[PDB]
Design a protein around this ligand. Structure first.
Ligand SMILES: [Mg+2]
Lengths: 135, 99, 220, 130
């Protein structure tokens, strides 16, 4: 009638083996689609072993040079007066504007962090935004 | 065609940084007698109670202001291989959105 | 008979037969919050290859691999619908149960978002009736039940040799799912997008099956 | 068992005609109450169990309600919830839940339009509703 073993192999592997054996005389309709279009990974059962020892995960942290600049702004001025809005795909945050002007300012050849940070704050003040320093 | 990596860099979520103490606006999508299910654009929905002042104008689709503390509440207990999520988020009400 | 073989084998020779590549894109998925995931603590071990990275303890699903998987999933879903196949929507989540139930009604296919009985797919003759035709495809919009365990239908379907196309979050087990689609299954915009994509995929398959049938009828 | 019910329906009508013929009454008005008093006379069963006495009634009332065929010749279930095990109960639940959302949506629209034309009709105490 069929095979009900989950761990032997994929559904494709068992179906074509039974058909080749001669027990299943009616080819399932989904089988033809599978041969033409195979998935990226064949569905083979594998036991979720727990990781022991010095082995760690290979997932990398998502960090950018922008994040380093954002840390200084958040540490000094805290959260900006503008309210973050995640519904707008093209939203421009106050911190993001600070980073963008920070990148443009450092293209002039300035290396000192203090000069870059102070001038960016003064430049933002010229645009009308509020940068009340925390503490 | 814009590469997926470029999309994350300019996304508002990445620009937020740490989720603690961030002023984020949200929209209410479900109303109970005392609980307001608020969606702030994050993965899950935060729950807050109706304030005693101007409580009659908190209706479906109304925009409010939130202070995110944890993007997703999740902790680990002993004897648990995997952390037990709460499928919610932690936030507080600072008032209604000033249109 | 031979023409019946012709109509069945006609769509097998074209990869883009249903023109599904225009339904979605990387930008479309990104605005639906499909690239978000659970915390780093709940990251299942088998979902490591599908993760682009972790952002401050929050896993980010690589949409480039999602688009590749979703393209095959929709393509596979349409073909089994083209061949007059039974499609079942299974999702044990008490926030989209009504939406998924209504989605299947519009497509004309079946849905099961209620409590799943033990001997349903395996002991079908006793549960349903003497002669019952088992579903030819199962769609999982959520592979986990309300107690954070893998759904029974995932294991039972593999026993009965029924292909499953299921959205797997960052804490799911895509081992037994033949067409996994790594994405987000919690945010309402994400779940709504997946249902609509499967809505048009089924409707196009149903319609284009009828159009070719009309051409066959006037052939002879 | 659709045909078996149909056979019972036609012969009961024929049987009723014979009962009216021997009773010497008008067959056009041989009501069920007349059938019961006729049967209780022709077959005088003295038994205390009321359900054990001879009966001849409408086969629809006698035979229990039967499930209809749930699938066509190709095996496709007719209803869209057949694979939940209980199609009738869950379809009722699905429709009932849908009405609540429509009422909630309709009430939400009415609140937007600032109109409250509905009233609570749940209280049916004088009629004695359960
Ligand atoms: Mg999830």
């Amino acid at each position: 009638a069929g095979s009900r073993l989950e761990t032997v192999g994929s559904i494709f592997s068992r179906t074509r083996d039974l058909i080749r054996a001669g027990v299943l005389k009616e080819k399932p309709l989904w089988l033809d689609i599978y041969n033409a279009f195979p998935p990226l990974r064949e569905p083979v059962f594998r036991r979720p072993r727990l990781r022991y020892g010095k082995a760690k995960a290979a997932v990398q942290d998502i960090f950018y040079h922008e994040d380093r600049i954002r840390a200084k702004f958040y540490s000094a001025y805290g959260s900006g007066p503008k309210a973050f809005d995640l519904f707008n795909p093209n939203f421009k945050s106050t911190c993001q504007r600070f980073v963008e002007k920070y990148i443009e300012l450092q293209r002039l050849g300035e290396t000192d962090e203090e000069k870059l940070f102070v001038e960016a704050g003064k430049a933002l003040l010229a645009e009308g935004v509020t940068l009340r320093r925390v503490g | 065609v814009e590469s997926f990596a470029s999309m994350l860099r300019h996304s508002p979520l990445t620009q937020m940084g740490p989720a603690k103490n961030k002023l984020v606006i949200g929209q209410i999508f479900h109303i109970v007698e005392d609980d307001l299910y608020i969606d702030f654009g994050g993965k899950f929905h935060c729950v807050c109670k109706r304030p005693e002042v101007d409580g009659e104008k908190y209706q479906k689709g109304t925009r409010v202001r939130l202070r995110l503390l944890d993007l997703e509440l999740t902790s680990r207990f002993l004897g648990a291989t995997t952390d037990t999520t709460i499928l919610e988020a932690d936030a507080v009400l600072l008032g209604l959105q000033e249109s | 008979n031979d023409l019946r073989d012709r109509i069945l084998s006609e769509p097998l020779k074209h990869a883009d037969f249903f023109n599904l590549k225009e339904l979605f894109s990387v930008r479309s998925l990104f605005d639906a919050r499909v690239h978000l995931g659970h915390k780093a603590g709940c990251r299942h071990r088998f979902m490591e290859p599908y993760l682009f990275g972790s952002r401050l303890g929050q896993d980010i699903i690589d949409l480039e691999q999602t688009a590749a998987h979703l393209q095959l999933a929709l393509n596979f879903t349409a073909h089994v619908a083209y061949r007059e196949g039974i499609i079942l929507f299974v999702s044990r989540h008490r926030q989209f149960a009504h939406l998924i139930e209504t989605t299947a009604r519009d497509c004309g296919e079946y849905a099961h978002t209620r409590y799943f009985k033990g001997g349903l797919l395996t002991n079908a003759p006793l549960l349903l009736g003497p002669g019952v035709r088992l579903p030819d495809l199962i769609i999982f919009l959520h592979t986990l039940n309300n107690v954070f365990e893998p759904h029974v239908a995932v294991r039972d379907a593999a026993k009965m040799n029924i292909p499953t196309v299921g959205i797997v979050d960052t804490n799911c087990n895509p081992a037994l799912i033949t067409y996994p689609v790594p994405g987000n299954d919690d945010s309402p915009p994400a779940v709504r997008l997946f249902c609509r994509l499967f809505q048009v995929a089924i409707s196009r398959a149903k319609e284009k099956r009828r159009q070719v049938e009309a051409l066959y009828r006037l052939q002879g | 068992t659709v045909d078996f019910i149909k056979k019972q329906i036609e012969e009961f009508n024929i049987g009723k005609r014979h009962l009216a013929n021997m009773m010497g009454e008008d067959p056009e008005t041989f009501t069920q109450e007349d059938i019961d008093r006729a049967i209780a006379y022709l077959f005088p069963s003295g038994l205390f169990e009321k359900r054990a006495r001879p009966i001849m009634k409408h086969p629809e009332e006698i035979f229990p309600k039967q499930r209809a065929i749930q699938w066509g010749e190709d095996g496709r279930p007719f209803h869209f919830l057949f694979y939940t095990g209980k199609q009738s109960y869950y379809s009722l639940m699905h429709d009932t839940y849908g009405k609540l959302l429509d009422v909630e949506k309709h009430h939400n629209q009415l609140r937007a339009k600032d109109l409250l034309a509905e009233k609570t009709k749940i209280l049916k105490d004088p009629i004695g509703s359960r």
